[PDB]
């Protein structure tokens, strides 16, 4: 087996109208249901997406200058000017320098003196930001097939399935991010979830995300450096390119994988199916007596819960999973189990089991003691 | 007829207990529903609306400059002072101008001078924030009505109803705004749906939300520039106002109606009615077999959906309308379909139809073949 | 007694399949269900807390200056420099002082100078945001007990109860804060909930949120001044701890209370609940016809709702307490009462009823008019 079956309380057959299915659909799992002589029925999530994200802002990590010019006056003689200053290309820098003989002035004394440099971005990166009509989850219902697409303002669909006819799906995101508070930082080909506040903070120049032309950057002088004026010249250095700092920067953050221009996440659904008045088949899993080997250990996920992912090697399946975690004594806590109903279809077979542990050191207890899994874990 | 009814999976009879009902509340329908021997019961959304939001910031688009001050030193004779220099109203500016024998001054060389003007704010405009306690939808319930008021904070409301006595009915936002990322800009009496960042970096003087007063305002020197010192005098001059710039920076922005103080969406509720156990009227709709005709053309919702206005000239009303999205190719997407069993009560009578397409080119197709229309559409 | 039971319409029982409930947990109440032949069951929300919420920006309130050290310049030799303004723990800045016979140079006129003075915070209060990892609340089930975790990330849970075997309870909070607009500002022992842009525009020194070593301050010059230069010396000034301002402008803002590193919130959940097919108890209560008296004035909660406390000293408890909300006229409004079904369970024992009026005028109309409350409320 494969898919797992729906428990007898997971929906209700209505005396008149219909009956109605509550389903939970994560990544990596499928979820089946039978009507009395109807064909049965799979469910998987496929995939969730964001298609498009729109640039919150731009920031340029590398920008080279160039065309560096200077108006110097001599005591008496004023401010000095450059129509460059008018230029948003350039970075300019008005100051006072001493003037004298040296320097073909007949008084000796402060004068004022302007540069300008054009600032040109080589190299940037951008904060984009997930919006709701950005994402879009893909269910694959299987009678025994039909993709169907689902995103928060189109959480309801109705699909036709032979022996069932017309069933109506409403599903809606489970366990992922706060779009409002993450932002996707981009650098070439690579991707992070990063705070959009950290994020609006970064000391270098930017542009706004609606910004096309991409020349006229604001705060240049986070890269730029004037050099201390000279009688009638001045030289402007800038700062390398910061892709490595930002890599420095990034050590902590999660990594988003990219397909060109759109990103995947690990969503989960949560899904009520209502279709005409059917008896429908639950199931009732007894729980694995059997030794549990770790596959992987325990991992964080991208939004904020981990994963354990975990093969049964004893007998009995399809069996339920024993399941706890405890805190740094030995009182179990409810609840925090994400993966609801862990069940493992069959033997040597990896499963994923998902949860959310309290702050602090609690324990993940998986199996029962004839061979039991005692897992640490400190959080935050 | 002007009512939708509901299909008989869309309600639940228990055993024991009551019946459980779900709708969906779009502006422009009307869904019915009849229990056995009961009144017939009407439920539509008449309106969306944010009331009193607050203000997040106030920015000044015209200000006047009066009472230009001015005090210049000579040379060894220090920095010059303003006492206007305290008073927030005033915009000031220290800087360094030539003295000598023309202008009083025994030596020639560099004399400090600083130059304040009162900075007075002639027109603003600000940008709100819609929080929970500000939005308010409308329902009206008519059986053969009473006008229910549903909020994010308080979802569920028991009301009497003759034939039925109490029914209670839970309703939730359905396809509307990010709130948290969109921002309400106003002018005058016109307003604009904007992103928040893009609104908290225009270039302009601004004061904070809670802001009374109206006269300290921040960053002034956006609007002001001081020109070059005269020996004891220096001139200040104000950009104008601002109104025709931000016109031309909104082009592309959504554009909300107000109705003084308070703003009207277009929104959208799922509502779960709940009462006591009766049989209820399930209705279920033939496909249109007629053609349609295109009242208003694809046109984009405030909430980045879609609304494809159409009249139905056939035969056979209440009819459901054929309905389908397909890629640049022609493999259908199932979902995207907001309004969820589009149906048309009636002949000549306008329906709208809402979806939210795919990103790219995709097809909308109404209708079956003999007269369907196939419209074009690209996203983003 | 002490609980509230539900009403008929709050459960559906199925055909086949199981039996699914519908429960609201407020603090302070007690729901209780109860199934033929099978315990009793009580259900309760006991608390709703953040734990660890993570920081967002520091901010200084209190900074000492130390080791100031200066560096001028005569005529003719050009810009000073400084070290120290390399070194991000120290606030510098540059100028011009008149130099002459009296300083030890051979001509008068400006010279260049520069001031370093060593910043250090004293006292510091921090932003914090609450994310949904941080959000936690404590359901207790008692069967006549089990205490179940729920978080917005794992609001499913499955419980077993005596006589029930295997419930699951799926819990989502129905009317809190927006944690986006929203943030926990922190000083010492006391907390605040704060708009995040005000906050974020307070003119401070401050440091990141994941900021560890807490030093290198950005904008100190909002609490420093450097006073006017003298020949070879400058003297920079601090403001004095801005504790006392930061209570002023904390004033009309709403205050949370802390248990050492976390806080308490007044939660309120809506539940399901779903379990075997089973025939539960339904309640109905009759109108109370006595008089009440308010306990508690009406009073703000700290999410935009309104709570009044009342005691019933009529006689009939269990009874439903007549409530209504009109406008300034007479016209009665449909919803707005967050505590649905308000019933007193005993006479002389106190009973919070929330609701959320509309803004401006309105009346909170409490009994039958034998001894009525009528309680007048201005809202924003
Ligand atoms: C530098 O001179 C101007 C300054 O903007 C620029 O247009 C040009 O491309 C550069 N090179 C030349 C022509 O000197
Ligand atoms: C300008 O002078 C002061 C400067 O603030 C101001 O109070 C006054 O209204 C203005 N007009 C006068 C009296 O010159
Ligand atoms: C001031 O001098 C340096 C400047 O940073 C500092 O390290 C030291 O602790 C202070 N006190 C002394 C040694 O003068
Ligand atoms: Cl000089």
């Known amino acids: 087996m494969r898919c797992i079956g729906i428990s007898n309380r997971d929906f209700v057959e209505g005396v008149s109208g219909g009956s109605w299915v509550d389903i939970v659909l994560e990544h990596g799992s499928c979820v089946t249901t039978m009507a009395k002589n109807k064909p049965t029925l799979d ?3 496929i995939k969730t997406e964001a298609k498009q994200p729109a ?3 731009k920031y340029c990590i590398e920008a080279k200058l160039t065309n560096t010019t200077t108006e110097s006056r001599c005591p008496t003689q004023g ?10 290309r350039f970075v300019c820098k008005h100051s006072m320098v001493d003037r004298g003989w040296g320097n073909g002035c007949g008084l000796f004394g402060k004068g004022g003196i302007v540069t300008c440099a054009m600032f040109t971005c080589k190299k940037n990166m951008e904060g984009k930001i997930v919006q709701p009509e950005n994402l879009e989850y893909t269910v694959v219902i299987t009678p025994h097939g039909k993709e169907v697409k689902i995103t928060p ?3 309801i669909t109705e699909a036709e399935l032979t022996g069932y006819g017309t069933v109506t799906m409403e599903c809606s995101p489970r366990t992922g991010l706060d779009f409002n508070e993450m932002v996707l930082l981009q650098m070439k080909d690579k991707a992070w979830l990063v705070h959009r506040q950290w994020f609006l903070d970064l000391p270098l120049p930017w542009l706004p995300g609606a910004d096309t032309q991409g020349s006229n950057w604001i705060q240049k002088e986070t890269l730029v450096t004037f050099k201390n004026p000279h009688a009638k010249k001045q030289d402007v250095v800038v700062l390398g390119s910061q892709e490595g700092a930002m890599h420095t920067a990034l050590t902590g953050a999660t990594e988003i994988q990219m397909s060109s221009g759109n990103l995947l996440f690990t969503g989960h659904l949560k899904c009520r199916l209502r279709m005409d008045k059917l008896q429908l088949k639950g199931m009732s899993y007894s729980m694995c007596t059997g030794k ?8 964080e996920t991208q939004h904020g819960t981990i994963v354990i992912r975990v093969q049964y090697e004893g007998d009995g399946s399809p069996c ?3 399941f706890e975690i405890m805190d740094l004594e030995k009182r179990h806590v409810l609840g925090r189990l ?3 109903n862990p069940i493992v279809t069959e033997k040597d077979s990896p499963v994923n089991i998902e949860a959310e542990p309290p ?4 324990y993940i207890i998986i199996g029962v003691e004839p061979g039991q899994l005692k897992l640490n874990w400190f959080k935050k």
């Open 43 to 45: 469910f998987e999530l």
């Open 55 to 57: 640039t919150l802002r």
């Open 79 to 88: 401010e000095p000017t450059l129509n460059e200053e008018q230029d948003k």
């Open 153 to 155: 303002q189109s959480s």
């Open 292 to 299: 549990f080997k770790v596959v992987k250990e325990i991992a």
């Open 320 to 322: 339920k999973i024993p």
């Open 338 to 340: 994400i993966t609801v």
């Open 359 to 362: 702050f602090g050191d609690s």
